[PDB]
Amino acid sequence: SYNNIPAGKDAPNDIYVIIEIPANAAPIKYEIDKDSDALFVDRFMGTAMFYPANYGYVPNTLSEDGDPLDVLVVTPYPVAAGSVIRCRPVGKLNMEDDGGIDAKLIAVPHEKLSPLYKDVKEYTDLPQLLINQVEHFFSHYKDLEPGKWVKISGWEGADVAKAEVIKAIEAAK
Amino acid sequence: SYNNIPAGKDAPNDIYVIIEIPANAAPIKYEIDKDSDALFVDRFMGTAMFYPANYGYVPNTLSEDGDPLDVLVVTPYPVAAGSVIRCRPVGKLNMEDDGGIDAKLIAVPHEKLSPLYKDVKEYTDLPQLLINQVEHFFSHYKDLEPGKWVKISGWEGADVAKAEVIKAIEAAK
Amino acid sequence: SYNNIPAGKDAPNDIYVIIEIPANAAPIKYEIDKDSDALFVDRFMGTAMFYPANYGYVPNTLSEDGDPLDVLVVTPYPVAAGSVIRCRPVGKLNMEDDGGIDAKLIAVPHEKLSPLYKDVKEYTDLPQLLINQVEHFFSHYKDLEPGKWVKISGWEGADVAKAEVIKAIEAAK
Amino acid sequence: SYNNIPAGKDAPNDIYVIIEIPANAAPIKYEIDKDSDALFVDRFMGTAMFYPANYGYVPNTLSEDGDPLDVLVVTPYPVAAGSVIRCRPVGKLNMEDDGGIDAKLIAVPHEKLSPLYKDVKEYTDLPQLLINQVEHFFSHYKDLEPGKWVKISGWEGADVAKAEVIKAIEAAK
Amino acid sequence: SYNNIPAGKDAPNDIYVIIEIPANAAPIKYEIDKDSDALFVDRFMGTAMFYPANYGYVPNTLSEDGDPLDVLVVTPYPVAAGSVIRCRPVGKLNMEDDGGIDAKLIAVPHEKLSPLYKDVKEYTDLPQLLINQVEHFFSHYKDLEPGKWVKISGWEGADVAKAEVIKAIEAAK
Amino acid sequence: SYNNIPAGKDAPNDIYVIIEIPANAAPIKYEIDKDSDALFVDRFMGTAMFYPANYGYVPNTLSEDGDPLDVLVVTPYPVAAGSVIRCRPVGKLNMEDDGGIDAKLIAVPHEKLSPLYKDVKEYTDLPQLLINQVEHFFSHYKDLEPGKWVKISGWEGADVAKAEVIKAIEAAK
Ligand SMILES: [Mg+2]
Ligand SMILES: [Mg+2]
Ligand SMILES: [Mg+2]
Ligand SMILES: [Mg+2]
Ligand SMILES: [Mg+2]
Ligand SMILES: [Mg+2]
Ligand code: NA
Ligand code: NA
Ligand code: NA
Ligand code: NA
Ligand code: NA
Ligand code: NA
């Protein structure tokens, strides 16, 4: 089951992300049901938007919102919903919403999976337009869900994102 | 596992359906293998038809044919095979086949998932053409499987469909 | 060629729309090149958005912006880019942008093509969420194109939309 | 334009078919508008069916129904709508409908395009299930269009299909 | 879980294959993680190639390379990643690589799933071009993975492939 | 028609490419028929490969092989077959085949279409893996077409590619 997957083979530098929503997919928000391991349809998204990168969580972590830590994973082609990507954080996007504050990490595939991201050490090494798309997506994807808003605060770098992984790991135990 | 999912959060009005065949998909009939929870290919369909809505079953139910209770779930876009939709029955389609009688419920997503079906209380609140497509699909999708036929009997409403959910729940215990 | 297609078989009630961008498609903005009739890639869209309905124009019309009159056409499944839909206006969405003002009509397929929209006489007969998605899409799809903004003004009904078709037809001669 | 394409490089054995509806596609019936060469949406199909092979017509031919001669073309993967396949008839399917009688040829790609059909000389050299799917498709695809019915009469072979191509060619002049 | 699936309902003639990579899919190599049963992204493939048939393994088997026995399964349409096909071996492809030797079986769906392969008893009953595509795919798909090469040795028939299934079954206990 | 499209708005730095085969598409080789402007199926490709970038030609040019000059165009998402991309050459790939020598240019979208390639001035500014994929694709995509082989010679830069555009333009007059 998904519970058997460690937060990573090697901590913050070498982590696993279980993908719930593929990049470039239909506007269906899935979420792994923790009791059953099944992919639940959580929402048919209102806005006509798509996730600019694969979206999921690091197993065996806990964030402030009671869910595991959220991560976007950039890949050369979208991966299957429910599949698991070995990856490496390169940044952290901070935001405020209607329920306080939120954050999403961004990660790239481990070099065992692809050579394409060898030179991507910080989120600023990704295409500037991709970074803008991610900011714009999280700023607006809930605009048609009543009582929901999101304001983008700003980014922090790979080191701070990796620190967030470690904090979420300890928080889960 | 799928066995951990209850028939619903709240009985006949708020139920779960595990999707085996997405709407508008390739003509592959999948079926969840109960021993393993895996999606098995049960048949490469003979006819050049597709399911007009997502097709699956309510967990922890038992119908007359020894399988869990069958449900079609209407959604704004097809969901992933094996995913789980929180939904609400709005009708029941009765049929005769080569092995006696059969029935399929039709359901719409719970309001937590989408506002689009708030005003859909009965199957007659859905587009008349969709209802016709569903009747025509079940009437003909097995036409090229030898020894198989299906005749449509007629529809019953949301209340009777919900009664069928409760009967199938008790039958499973 | 596209120039041979009349604005419609029967004026404002029965019109043709040449689709440039299908509903639910990749974020590529095509535009028909009038000299060649070819589909040109006009822009790889910055935002992670998709058109909520098929987008195109009425041939042999002229709008204030020197291009033919713009129309969104709702269909049960997205149509091919460059294909031509016989349809009927049901509304007009007014907006302001960086270059003044703009408007988009919304239309449904002619009854010869589908019975699904027989009861859709006004844009308010469409799902309220679809209308919201259209407003939100045009409000934000150019957010990542520098120097571009759009503010939604409001909607007018089918009669006013049809009047716009007639005005654009006369303007083209 | 499509009018510039001959019925074939070499008569009945080596012909061109302009594809209007790809195999395995959404249930949208396109038709080439002869005045403009554009792909028109002719119908959003009622039944939940798909064409088992690519569907189109032989240019510069005329059938009894005032349209060019209809052909299904089997291919290893569906081709783009509006594209043109060099092919070779292998059979003719006869039917009765509400307007009298109808027929559809079936063809395979020319050996210049693929070696896969070298041994397919007659429609009976194709998979028996494919032939059944084609019969079942034409028998039922108009079941939800009011006042439409189709009854399958039977098949004739490659030679008779090729004779039909020649008759339709002469009929167009 | 996948571990609950037997190598087959009936040995070498009637076996199960868990599909990791669908036919005709994006160039993402998935692999089932045995500890968790989850689909892991193992590699974003370097070459611009796709698997000519569905790729996976027979559960409860063990090959020389410490992984379960590899099988390609031919189907009329690609199946979902992670789904399970009841099938029957028809051949065995032998190869040498950088780590010694390797082999892949090829199988067709059980007659309960489809009649299309009733007459396919040996791999030489499949289209010759498909067999060539499979040879060419395995010969070249790792060409852009550093230090990887594959040379095709040749094929053996259905009986030898079935013997390989039995050997791998005993090896797993 | 396509003949009305100039080789470019501004010569070698600002050119048009008519796409015949989209990136990441089914293995169908289309070719624009010059007499009719229609997209012809030229070949169902034997190898299980896909074009790593959109493939087409510069209108109103002539290469040594009697066809217009060939170009690969890199885009963030594949474009529709038959569509036209405003782009800019960044490199030239030289090869030998069974009929002597061949070459393919590689280009990126004009800045009016996307900001993503502003810093891509030479083919060596693209991902090294993409360049390898292109070399490997042309080296092997005809391996299963009898009597066809291709050997890669090497690359030249943007300036030489642009010189090739000018030579092909003059050659067409
Ligand atoms: Mg969260
Ligand atoms: Mg049942
Ligand atoms: Mg405009
Ligand atoms: Mg006809
Ligand atoms: Mg192996
Ligand atoms: Mg050439
Ligand atoms: Na809101
Ligand atoms: Na039957
Ligand atoms: Na802006
Ligand atoms: Na009828
Ligand atoms: Na290598
Ligand atoms: Na060869």
Author numbering:
A (entry chain A), B (entry chain A), C (entry chain A), D (entry chain A), E (entry chain A), F (entry chain A): 1 to 173
Give the text the authors published on this PDB structure.
In Structure 1, we identified not only one Mg2+ (M1) bound to the catalytic center, but also a Na+ bound to a loop (residue 143–149) close to the catalytic center. This indicates that all monomeric AbPPases have the same structure. In AbPPase, β-ketone groups from two highly conserved residues, Lys143 and Lys149, coordinate with this Na+. Moreover, Pro147 forms the turn of that loop. Since this loop is close to the catalytic center, this Na+ might regulate hydrolysis activity by modifying the conformation of the loop. The elution profiles of AbPPase in these running buffers are the same, indicating that the inhibitory effects of Na+ occur via binding to the loop, rather than by altering the global structure of the enzyme.
However, because PPi is stable under normal conditions, inorganic pyrophosphatase (PPase) has evolved to specifically hydrolysis the molecule. Here, we solved four crystal structures of a family I type PPase from a strain of the pathogen Acinetobacter baumannii.
